[PDB]
Structures are given as structure tokens and as C-alpha cells.
């Protein structure tokens, strides 16, 4: 057991040994971006491929070219933390080595005269933080993977929704990675047509004419040949035995039914036929007589009676024709040739040029390059390696592994396979099959956008080289880095898949980095999506979680990676499986994709195994081709590696998931991502054992990079002295972990790292040193454990309402810390420069009490709504004051000032503590006093780590000096090393001071920015949304007094009272099981607390702990005898607040184990206690379910949802009230509200809400004046939107008017 796990061992109720540990949760991001940036010697992945796809650049004339050598990424200007602080993108500069070469016109090409090689800068590539995030414009963002159609050929049909006939029209469609789409469809008259770029249909034969195929060759490829001869004045077939199986059979006794197998045992190579058998048949070749000089019969022409005689007179004796059936073979290609109008390649090229470019005059040379550019050009068409493999697998081609452009055989085989599907052989491809859908991650998207930018620069470079004036030009004159930087910035800042990082809790972190979206560029549309894509395909087993998909329009279109899912080298999801050999089951596993899954049978973890390592039941449950069933034991091929393989990380954290309906499990998984961290993090009493993995892999915790002993612990710094086995020679020997303290998250939530270590104790690698938000001792801890009674209480838990005690409000169990940003930007205006100062006109002294001399509030100031944070004065123009106003000014004095008060004030209903102030000044502007104080504060904070490092290095050096004390030589060496260390420290501090003192690249027009961080402690109140982990959401209806809530015999009151009515209908029974198990766990916890209190001997404590950890026939073997005395005491101390129990999904604790633990805790086996009413004292006549449940505080607070408005700001054009709390807007009275008032008959209320409240400009002012006067009468007028409509209609030249 690790040190961080030995402190609090969670009891495991699982029964199936674990073979494969859960891999890194964020591998999908890290591996993709590492492939993007890392060097590729073979150049198939990463920026190497992007450079090799465009470079070298050839000019039109061929005078010169630009070539590529290598690339590198420089040292970043900043790190992640200060990149967030200033608001700049964390990135590395791209520096590429290029050589310019010039070729002479007189001299033959390929002669190198001189080369000019150097390193040019072509933009800045955003780097990915170790946790898998990007810092763009100072904000943390996640690039979300995209599930898209795999490149290649897809065969599908219509199912019969085009025409009322029972016929089904089949079609095929090729999707390139880069290129133009190509379709082959069937019309409802048995003809095959071609569609290029979704244009109007053309006969398919055109795409063969254009490829040098004469009609004879077309008939040869697309049909089989049956031959005829004239032997002894008799017509003659050939021998193909499978064809015959009825006029007669000229094989003597082998004759039949004037079944063929009867005499097919004996073979003869002759069949005679009448003349009539040929009349209905069609030709296969072209026959020309030299004497006549004309064409008697054409290919694909119906043979007539006189045709036979004329051919015989011509001297031809061999006649080969096509082969046509009604079931197995068809005339589709022949009829398509009959409906085409072209006869030669160039005429077809003219036809496709007319279609591609409607109205353009027919030009031949243009036609040639158009077709060569459409599919056969590497620049405009690119079938990727994955697309190439899908192509070679679909049509059966076995070569051209590196080719990326279509050729003759590709289209030939696509046509052949589609005709074979129309015949009956073969089946269509499943569109939703995960072997037909691919995962595209950060690396591929970045490659694509980088290549787009490279093309943007390629055009200009080619043009400049085509000018030809190349005498003094080094390569950093054709390369323009700004377009490439613009492309990468566009992708990383304005893409639909580049989203703000959901940062409520570590589970939000992980789920956002493991999300797969079918939307985005090259994806789907919410309104245009269908049922089929949203549905759960059977290939999702172990690849996509069937549970967590958002409720609503985005249902099914957004999925989550399963626990063990992985991406192969081609981008297809694969999942692990344990192989079986000789009937035994092996530890080592193989990763299989959707295509490979269909062939084998796959058992699952629930299958019972023997002590010999093999299946027990003869008929084990397994899957074939997506169908579950019972299969023989000896037929098995693979078994699942874990019970949580089909469910993702969020759903793997729901205890007793197998006892919940899928709907409520989905609601719980989605709702567990919205939890808000609290002041104190407490572990879940009932968990699943996955919390440690999520907490460690989220990155919120501080994980020890190397083992050793903690030299020093502080709330902000942890210094670890590394053991002398992991010390690289020459290293200082210490590691410093700086902890984030009260940093605003993306969702205005505190991010705080709390030390969980002492000074001097030993730590190993991977151990947790600090706990981040929603983490307790290395375990994920979202909500709090609440005592729960399942019983109705006077309607205060009606529907999903929740009744909450005052004890938990007083104990601050659900109090949260929210950090808010407020910015004051002093700009430069036409009248003058806006100034940040404390000399605010028309404001007294009390409002300036919290302001400093500069005009910025102090750190630690308690502010409320309306208080000034930054004092700012704005120059203003002359005001033409009204006559009574100048009366007031004349009588009372009080001359007007030249500045108006435009100051940053705290928003209403917001009251908190100022915790940080940041001042950003444009270069060349006088830095105010507060900016100087902040600068010195940051310098003083920043020199400490360098000071400690220099001190320890100099102490080691002086110890070496004393130990050494030939002599003078060692003294001189020590002195020079000391000087080198001093110089290194000076350089580091110089770089630091340069960073803090460096000015800020602000936006044009702004002179100063002041940023204030406000911390607000939000307590739990009625209207707040609280939830469990089983879809049982609710809104608090009352904060009940303690004496009024139900209590037990010992006097302990409940904390939350929940309605039982919502359990049976909603089919979430895992919650009741969680309540019972939590009751047992807290019972065991209080037993350990008692044993601690009266200081019982350690022998009894050890015996009880061993008894607890040995309950049930589980997979966990915990030996308390192997723990030290202090370790046992620490374990007992951490188990005082309850025994944490792990119930893995689909491997959970049975009811027998729950009742056994309830018995061990001296509690009723039914889990129901006798409660007493606090108000009356009378016991409830039925026992009530009481226990402990993990409650979450969702980020749906009534504080930021309550909104009210009487009169505020209005829209510019519509003259209607704004929309939104942030804008102080009004509610929308839509169409259905108008319908409801029309149904009621409220004409006057409707008129008032239409005119006065919304857009009657004079009406609302008059109504306000009347209400102030106390009249409550209105004089309605014309709505402004109707006048806008009249003006807009008149602008269309339409005379609309009002008559009298």
C-alpha cells in the first residue's frame, strides 16, 4: 500500500480480481499533441508531414524553388502561470530551416549555383499544459475530439423513401480527406449515374469514356462473355457448367425438360441453339467487313434476324455476346451505355466541363486540367493513409499503400462492388458503425490548420519566385508568418471545438478532456441530425459510454470515452480484452477495434471462473456480431478486462449503478459534473474506488515527482528532500512545490491547494502532497455526507423539494467560495485622457474611506453593493443646462466640474472581500504608486525560491571548502565555482526582474487596466439546488430549526428529509442501498470513535479493524498486523468519521454484505429506525429509512438566478428592454403568453405589456410619471417596432400606410 493510501484504506466490496489498471485518463490529448509536435524521422505525423506536403515550392517558370530542411520550437517567453496572469497565449516559436536555390535559364535545369540557407520564424504554436489544457488569451481551454466519417467509400441505399415502388435505389459515395465528393447512384429504372460535387446526375459511362475506355472495354470489364460458333452449319455455345443450372440440350442423352446435375457428371463441349435464342440478346464487340468498309453490327446492340445472315455472308464465324439474367446479373451497365449520348473521350470531357461550369464556352484544354485536377491531382485530392486502408479494404485492393489519389482501378472496383451489391452479393455498410467513424484529436486538427496557413504563404512565395528578380533575397523575405499565426489563432480561439474549460471540479476537468463531439467543422448539425446517429450502436461497448450524453437537443451527439477505450494509430477506438488459451485465461491483453470484434466471441467479467483459471459454466454468456447469447465454454476467445469497461469515468463513480434506471443514472452522471467545492472537503462514505484515479490524473493535486522526506511544509510551499537513490549527480537534492491559493476558476470558483503532509515523514513517488479543490487525502470529494430520512414532512419536500436542517447551515458544510473579476479600463478619448484618481466630484469622504491615494481599494476591504473600487474620472463636454437647473446653480453656487464620475462600483447584491488587485499600464505611461507597490511585492515574493536554492548551493560549496581544508588548487577551483553559482543566480534574478518590470501589450486606445478580485462566501439557502449521485435533484424549500426535525432514540436529529415518493416511479434504487450502506459505515466509524475515546488497548483496535476489513468474500486482503503502531493509530483516527466503503459498478456489495455490516455496527438489519417528531414528540407509527447520503451543491444558485427590473437600459433599434441579468434586462413575453392572455380575455393587460412596458417610448415615460403621481392610468401609443416595420417595408418600394 502506498503512503497516501495506508492513511485511509477504503474497504472493497468487489469480488473479481483486477488484471488491467485504468490507464492515464488524459492520454487521448497528450498522445495526440505529442504526435503533433514531436520530430518524425519518417514524416507521417506532426509538423513534418505538414511541411513536406507543401514544400518544396515550385515557380511557374521553374527558375527557382524553396526547400525545407528541419524545424525546432524555441524557449517560451513566459510560463503557464504568468501567461494566465497577463492574459497572453502560452506558446513556443516555430523556427524552420529553409534553403533558397536558383536555377539558370541558359544552363540545364537541376544545376545548383548557390544555396542560401537559414532559420526563419513562421509563427507561434500554442503548447499544451501537462494536464492537457491550452492557455489562449490567458484563459484555459480544451480542444474536444471529433467523431467524424472515416475517409473512404461508403455503400448505402434509400430503404425505399424516394418512390412509392418497392424498389430500393442503391448508391455509393467516396469521401476524401481533402478533395471533391464522388457518388454512384441507381435511378429507379435500372441505370447507374455519376455525381461529382453533388451536381446534377450524369450517366456513369462518362467517367469511363474520360478514362480511355472504348465501349468494348467497358463491356469486357462490366460483363461476362458467352461465345457462339458456326460448326458444320450449326450454332454452337461454349461450356460453363454452372451457367445452365430450356428449348433442349444437344448433349444426346444429357437432354433435359424440353437438375442439370444429373448428367453434368459427364461433360461434352458443345451445345446447339436456334436462331431465335439470339434475337433478344445484345452484342459484345464491333464487327467490320473490309470489303463493305462499314460497321455492320455495333457493340451493345441488339442482334436481329438479318444480322446473323449478314455476319455469315461477311465470313465471321465467332460471335461473343454478353450474359444477362434477372436475378444474378443485370443489364444496368448496358442500359446506362444506351442512355449516354457521348461517343468519344473528348465529347464526354466537354459534357463534364459544361456541367462543372454551366454556361462556360466549351474549351478542351481547360477540360483536361479540370479533370486532372478533380481527382488525379495530389494538390486538390488527398485520400489519407486511413482513407487509403479503408478503400483497399472495402474493394479488396491489396496494393498502392502510399497512393493518395484515385486511379483507373479504384473507380473500376467501386463500380464493380456496387453492381455486385445490386445483384445481391454483399451488404451495405453500417453508417453508425464505429469502424466507419474516426476520432480526430488536437494533433490532426492543428496539422490541418497549419497546412492551410502553409498554403496561404505558398501562394505568395510562388508568385514572388515567379517574378524572377532573385539577386539579394534571403528566405526571410518571402515567408509571411502572419497568415499562419492567424490560422492557428483562429483554430485555437474561435473553433466550436475549442471550448472554455469546465472547471467546477476535477471530474469536470477529466470529462471535458475525454469528450467526443459529432459537431464542429466537418461534422453534424443539431437541427439536421437524425435518430440513427443519436442511438446507441452495439459497437459502443467498451468504446463510448452509453450513459452520459447531455439531455436535450445535444442528445447522443456528445459522448464520453469509456474507461479503457484507446485510439489506435489510425484513429479508431479500441478496447482491451483478455485472451484465452487452452481454456485458461491469461493476464496479458490485446486491444481490439470494432471490425476485429465481430469475428470472435467475447465473454465478460461477470462470468464465473474456477481456481484453475477457467470458465465454470459450460454455456457462458458472450457476444457475436453485436448479438448476446449463450456459447460453449471451449468456443470462447476473449473476456472483458474490468466490470467498469462499458461505463465512463463519471458513471463509474455512481455506487450501485446496476440498481438504477439508465435515465436517472444519466441525470446523475451529468449532474455530478456541476458540483461546487466547499470549504471543507469530505470523502464519500460509499464510493467505487475510482476516486483516487480521477484525483491523481486531474492534476489538481500536488504529486511527488521524486521520493524522499518532506523537509518543510507550509500552506503555500512544500519542500521535499529527495532520497539519494533518485539523485541525478550535480543536483541540489530538493524539490519545491508551490501551491495555488485562492485562484479564480473559469466558473468563478475558488481553486485552492491544501497541504496534507507533515514535516519529516517519508513520501514516495506518486504520493499526494497537497489536495486541490474537491479532494480529500488524494480522493475525489465533491459533496458532503448528510444524514437522510426518507419520509414526507408537511409538504416541504413536495415533488423534489428538499428540507434542510439549520445544523448544516451553521456548520458551513455547503458554504462555497466564489472569486469574481471586476475590471476598470481607463482609455483615451477625443476630449482627453481618462484618469484613475481619488478626486471624484460629487462624492463625499465615507465613499473614499476604502480607497487609497491612487484611487484603488486596499487588500482585505469589506465592500458591499454600490461601493467604489476604482475611482475614475472621465472628461466630458459642455452641458446645456435647463433654466431651472441654472436657477439652482445661481442660488446654491456649486459650479460644475469638467469631469464626470465613471467609476468601478461593486454590483448590487454582491458583498465580499478584496483579495487581489492587479494594475496594468501601457508603456510610456506614468506608473502610479500602487503599481510600484505591487511590483515590489511581486519581486519580494519571487526572489525567495532563488534565494533558498542559492543558499543551499553555497552551503554545500562551503562545506566542501572546509572538508578539503594541492590546497591552493582546490581553493581556486572552489572560488571559481562559487563565482559561477553567483553569476547564475544573478542571471536568473535579472530575467525575473525583467519579467515583472516589463510593460504590458495592451489593446490600442487603453492607458490603464485595474483588476479587482472579490471573494464571496455563499451560504446554502432556499432555492439552491442540491443533488445526490443517482439523478435525485432538488431545490431547498426550507431551512428547518433543529428542534423541529425528526430524531432517533439517542436524540440525534436528521439533517435532510427526502420524499420517498420519487424513488419507486423513477427507479433509482441505488440511493436506498447507499443510505443503508452509509448507515452501516457511519456506525462502524462511531464504534471506532468510541474505542478511541476510552483509550482501549491497541490489541482490541487491531482485532476490530481486521474484523471489519475481512467482512464478506472480497478481493481485498488487508493485513492490519503488517501496519505499525503509529500507522494503525492514524488509520483509526481517519476512520472516526465513518468507514469508507468501495462498491464497484456491476461488482457491488450484495444485500447480504450490507446487512452483515449493519449487524457489525449494532444497527437494525432492515436499515429503518424509529423516529420521533420534534414538533410533537410522538413517534412515527411506521419505521423510517435513515442513513447517510452523499449530497452535492450544484452550480445553480438562486443568488445568480434571482433577477428583477422595473426600468433600465433599452435596445438601440427595437427600443425594447434588454435581455439577461448581466445586462439588467427584462423577461420575454413571447407568443404563447399573448395566446394565454387572449384566451383569458385580458385586453388591457395585453395592451399594457405590448405598448407601455416594451416599446412605446412616450408611453413608458408618461406611465412612470403617472405612477409616481399616483394615477395608474395609461394613454397608449404606437409601438416602435411597427414603425420600424413600416419603414422597412417602404424601403422595399412598397407603399404601406395608415388611413383615417
Amino acid at each position: 500500500y502506498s503512503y497516501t493510501e495506508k492513511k485511509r484504506i477504503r474497504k472493497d466490496f468487489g469480488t473479481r480480481p483486477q488484471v488491467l489498471d485504468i490507464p492515464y485518463l488524459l492520454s487521448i490529448q497528450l498522445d495526440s499533441f505529442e504526435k503533433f509536435i514531436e520530430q518524425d524521422p519518417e514524416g507521417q505525423y506532426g509538423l513534418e508531414a505538414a511541411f513536406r506536403s507543401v514544400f518544396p515550392i515550385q515557380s511557374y517558370n521553374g527558375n527557382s524553388e524553396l526547400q525545407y530542411v528541419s524545424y525546432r520550437l524555441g524557449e517560451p517567453v513566459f510560463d503557464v502561470k504568468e501567461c494566465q496572469i497577463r492574459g497572453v497565449t502560452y506558446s513556443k516559436p516555430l523556427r524552420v530551416k529553409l534553403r533558397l536555390v536558383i536555377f539558370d535559364k541558359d544552363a540545364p535545369a537541376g544545376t545548383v549555383k548557390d544555396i542560401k540557407e537559414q532559420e526563419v520564424y513562421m509563427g507561434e504554436i500554442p503548447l499544451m499544459t501537462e494536464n492537457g489544457t491550452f492557455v489562449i488569451n490567458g484563459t484555459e481551454r480544451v480542444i474536444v475530439s471529433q467523431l467524424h466519417r472515416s475517409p473512404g467509400v461508403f455503400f448505402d441505399s434509400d430503404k425505399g423513401k424516394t418512390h412509392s415502388s418497392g424498389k430500393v435505389l442503391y448508391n455509393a459515395r467516396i469521401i476524401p480527406y481533402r478533395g471533391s465528393w464522388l457518388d454512384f447512384e441507381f435511378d429507379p429504372k435500372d441505370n447507374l449515374y455519376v455525381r461529382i460535387d453533388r451536381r446534377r446526375k450524369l450517366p456513369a459511362s462518362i467517367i469511363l469514356r474520360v478514362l480511355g475506355k472504348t465501349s468494348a472495354e467497358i463491356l469486357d470489364i462490366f460483363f461476362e462473355k458467352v461465345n457462339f460458333e458456326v460448326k458444320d452449319q450449326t450454332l454452337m455455345m461454349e461450356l460453363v457448367p454452372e451457367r445452365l443450372r430450356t428449348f433442349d440440350i444437344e448433349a444426346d442423352g444429357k437432354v433435359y425438360v424440353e437438375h442439370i446435375r444429373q448428367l453434368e457428371k459427364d461433360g461434352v463441349n458443345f451445345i446447339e441453339v436456334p436462331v431465335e435464342y439470339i434475337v433478344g440478346k445484345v452484342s459484345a464487340k464491333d464487327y467490320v467487313n473490309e470489303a463493305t468498309g462499314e460497321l455492320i453490327i455495333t457493340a451493345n446492340q441488339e442482334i436481329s434476324l438479318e444480322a446473323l445472315a449478314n455476319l455469315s455472308q461477311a465470313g465471321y464465324k465467332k460471335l461473343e455476346v454478353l450474359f444477362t439474367n434477372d436475378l444474378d446479373h443485370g443489364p444496368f451497365m448496358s442500359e446506362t451505355l444506351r442512355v449516354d449520348s457521348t461517343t468519344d473521350r473528348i465529347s464526354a470531357l466537354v459534357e463534364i466541363y459544361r456541367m462543372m461550369r454551366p454556361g462556360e464556352p466549351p474549351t478542351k484544354e481547360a477540360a483536361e486540367s479540370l479533370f486532372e485536377s478533380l481527382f488525379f491531382s495530389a494538390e486538390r485530392y488527398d485520400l489519407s493513409t486511413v482513407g487509403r486502408m479503408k478503400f483497399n479494404s472495402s474493394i479488396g485492393r491489396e496494393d498502392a499503400e502510399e497512393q493518395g489519389t484515385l486511379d483507373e482501378v479504384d473507380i473500376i472496383e467501386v463500380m464493380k462492388k456496387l453492381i455486385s451489391i445490386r445483384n445481391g452479393k454483399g451488404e451495405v455498410d453500417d453508417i453508425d458503425h464505429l469502424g466507419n467513424r474516426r476520432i480526430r484529436s488536437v494533433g490532426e486538427m492543428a496539422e490541418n490548420q497549419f497546412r492551410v496557413g502553409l498554403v496561404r504563404v505558398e501562394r505568395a512565395v510562388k508568385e514572388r519566385l515567379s517574378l524572377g528578380d532573385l539577386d539579394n533575397v534571403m528566405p526571410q523575405d518571402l515567408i509571411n508568418a502572419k497568415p499562419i499565426s492567424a490560422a492557428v489563432k483562429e483554430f485555437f480561439g474561435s473553433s466550436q471545438l475549442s471550448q472554455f474549460m469546465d472547471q467546477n471540479n476535477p471530474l469536470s476537468e477529466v470529462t471535458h478532456k475525454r469528450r467526443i463531439s459529432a459537431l464542429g467543422p466537418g461534422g453534424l448539425t443539431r437541427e439536421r441530425a437524425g435518430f440513427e446517429v443519436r442511438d446507441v450502436h452495439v459497437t459502443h461497448y467498451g468504446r463510448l459510454c452509453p450513459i452520459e450524453t447531455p439531455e436535450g437537443p445535444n442528445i447522443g451527439l456528445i459522448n464520453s470515452l469509456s474507461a479503457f477505450a484507446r485510439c489506435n494509430e489510425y484513429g479508431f477506438l479500441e478496447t482491451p480484452y483478455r485472451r484465452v488459451v487452452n481454456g485458461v485465461v491469461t493476464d496479458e491483453v490485446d486491444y481490439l477495434s470494432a471490425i476485429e470484434e465481430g469475428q470472435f466471441v467475447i465473454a465478460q467479467a461477470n462470468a464465473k471462473l474456477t481456481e484453475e483459471g477457467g470458465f465454470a459454466d459450460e454455456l457462458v454468456t458472450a457476444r457475436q456480431k453485436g448479438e448476446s447469447g449463450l456459447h460453449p465454454r471451449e468456443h470462447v476467445d476473449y473476456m472483458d478486462v474490468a466490470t467498469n469497461q462499458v461505463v465512463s469515468i463519471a458513471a463509474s463513480l455512481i455506487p450501485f449503478l446496476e440498481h438504477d434506471d439508465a435515465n436517472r443514472a444519466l441525470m446523475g452522471a451529468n449532474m455530478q459534473r456541476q458540483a461546487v467545492p466547499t470549504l471543507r472537503s469530505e470523502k464519500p462514505l460509499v464510493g467505487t474506488g475510482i476516486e483516487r484515479n480521477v484525483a491523481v490524473d486531474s492534476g489538481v493535486t500536488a504529486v511527488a515527482k521524486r521520493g524522499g522526506v518532506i523537509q518543510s511544509v507550509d500552506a503555500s510551499r512544500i519542500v521535499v528532500k529527495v532520497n539519494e537513490e533518485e539523485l541525478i549527480p550535480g543536483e541540489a537534492g530538493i524539490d519545491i512545490y508551490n501551491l495555488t491559493k485562492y485562484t479564480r476558476s473559469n466558473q468563478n470558483t475558488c481553486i485552492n491547494q491544501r497541504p496534507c503532509v507533515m514535516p519529516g515523514e517519508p513520501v514516495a513517488r506518486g504520493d499526494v502532497l497537497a489536495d486541490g479543490p474537491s479532494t480529500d487525502l488524494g480522493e475525489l470529494a465533491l459533496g458532503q455526507n448528510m444524514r437522510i430520512a426518507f419520509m414526507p414532512w408537511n409538504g416541504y419536500n413536495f415533488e423534489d423539494s428538499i428540507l434542510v436542517s439549520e445544523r448544516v447551515v451553521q456548520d458551513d458544510r455547503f458554504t462555497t467560495i466564489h472569486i469574481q473579476e471586476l475590471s476598470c479600463v481607463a482609455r483615451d478619448t477625443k476630449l482627453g485622457a481618462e484618469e484613475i484618481t481619488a478626486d471624484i466630484p460629487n462624492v463625499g469622504e465615507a465613499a473614499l474611506s476604502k480607497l487609497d491615494e491612487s484611487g484603488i481599494v486596499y487588500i482585505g476591504a469589506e465592500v458591499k453593493g454600490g461601493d467604489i473600487l476604482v475611482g475614475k474620472v472621465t472628461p466630458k463636454g459642455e452641458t446645456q443646462l435647463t433654466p431651472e437647473e441654472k436657477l439652482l446653480r445661481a442660488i446654491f453656487g456649486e459650479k460644475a466640474s469638467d469631469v464626470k464620475d465613471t467609476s468601478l462600483r461593486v454590483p448590487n447584491s454582491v458583498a465580499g472581500t478584496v483579495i487581489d488587485v492587479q494594475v496594468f499600464t501601457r508603456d510610456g505611461v506614468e506608473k502610479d504608486k500602487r503599481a510600484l507597490e505591487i511590483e515590489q511585492m511581486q519581486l519580494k515574493e519571487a526572489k525567495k525560491d532563488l534565494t533558498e536554492e542559492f543558499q543551499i548551493l553555497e552551503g554545500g560549496l562551503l562545506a566542501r571548502v572546509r572538508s578539503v581544508l594541492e590546497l591552493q588548487n582546490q581553493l581556486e577551483q572552489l572560488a571559481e565555482q562559487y563565482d559561477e553559482l553567483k553569476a547564475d543566480f544573478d542571471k536568473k534574478f535579472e530575467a525575473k526582474r525583467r519579467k515583472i518590470t516589463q510593460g504590458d501589450d495592451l489593446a490600442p486606445g487603453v492607458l490603464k487596466i485595474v483588476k479587482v478580485y472579490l471573494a464571496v462566501k455563499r451560504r446554502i439557502q432556499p432555492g439552491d439546488k442540491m443533488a445526490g449521485r443517482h439523478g435525485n435533484k432538488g431545490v431547498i424549500s426550507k431551512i428547518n430549526p433543529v428542534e423541529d426535525m425528526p430524531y432517533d432514540e439517542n436524540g440525534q436529529p436528521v439533517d435532510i428529509v427526502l420524499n420517498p415518493l420519487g424513488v419507486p416511479s423513477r427507479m433509482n434504487i441505488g440511493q436506498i442501498l447507499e443510505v443503508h450502506l452509509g448507515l452501516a459505515a457511519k456506525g462502524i466509524g462511531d464504534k471506532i470513535n468510541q474505542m478511541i475515546k476510552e483509550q482501549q488497548e491497541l490489541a482490541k483496535l487491531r482485532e476490530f479493524l481486521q474484523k471489519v476489513y475481512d467482512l464478506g468474500d472480497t478481493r481485498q486482503r488487508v493485513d492490519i498486523s503488517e501496519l505499525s503502531d503509529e500507522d494503525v493509530r492514524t488509520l483509526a483516527h481517519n476512520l472516526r468519521a465513518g468507514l469508507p466503503v468501495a462498491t464497484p459498478v456491476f461488482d457491488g456489495a450484495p444485500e447480504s454484505s450490507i446487512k452483515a455490516m449493519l449487524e457489525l455496527a449494532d444497527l437494525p438489519a432492515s436499515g429503518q429506525l424509529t423516529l420521533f417528531d420534534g414538533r410533537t414528540g410522538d413517534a412515527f407509527e411506521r419505521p423510517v429509512t435513515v442513513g447517510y447520503m452523499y449530497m452535492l451543491k450544484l452550480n445553480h444558485l438562486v443568488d445568480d438566478k434571482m433577477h428583477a427590473r422595473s426600468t433600465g437600459s433599452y435596445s438601440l433599434v427595437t427600443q425594447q428592454p434588454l435581455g439577461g441579468k448581466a445586462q439588467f434586462g427584462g423577461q420575454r413575453f413571447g407568443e404563447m403568453e399573448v395566446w394565454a392572455l387572449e384566451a383569458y380575455g385580458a385586453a388591457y393587460t395585453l395592451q399594457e405589456m405590448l405598448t407601455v412596458k416594451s416599446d412605446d417610448v412616450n408611453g413608458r415615460t408618461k406611465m412612470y410619471k403617472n405612477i409616481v403621481d399616483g394615477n395608474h392610468a395609461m394613454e397608449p401609443g404606437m409601438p416602435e417596432s411597427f414603425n420600424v416595420l413600416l419603414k422597412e417595408i417602404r424601403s422595399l418600394g412598397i407603399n404601406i400606410e395608415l388611413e383615417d
Partner: peptide, 23 residues
Amino acid sequence: VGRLIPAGTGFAYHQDRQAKRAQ
């Protein structure tokens, strides 16, 4: 147009206008 609907409390009003349009 923002005036009373010819239904409910606004019915009679419109009737009067129709009467005023009858004369």
C-alpha cells in the same frame, strides 16, 4: 399595431367603434 384585441374586455370597445362606423 398595439391596440385592444376584439376579445374579452376589449370586445365592447370595438363594438362601439363599429357603431361609430355604422353612423
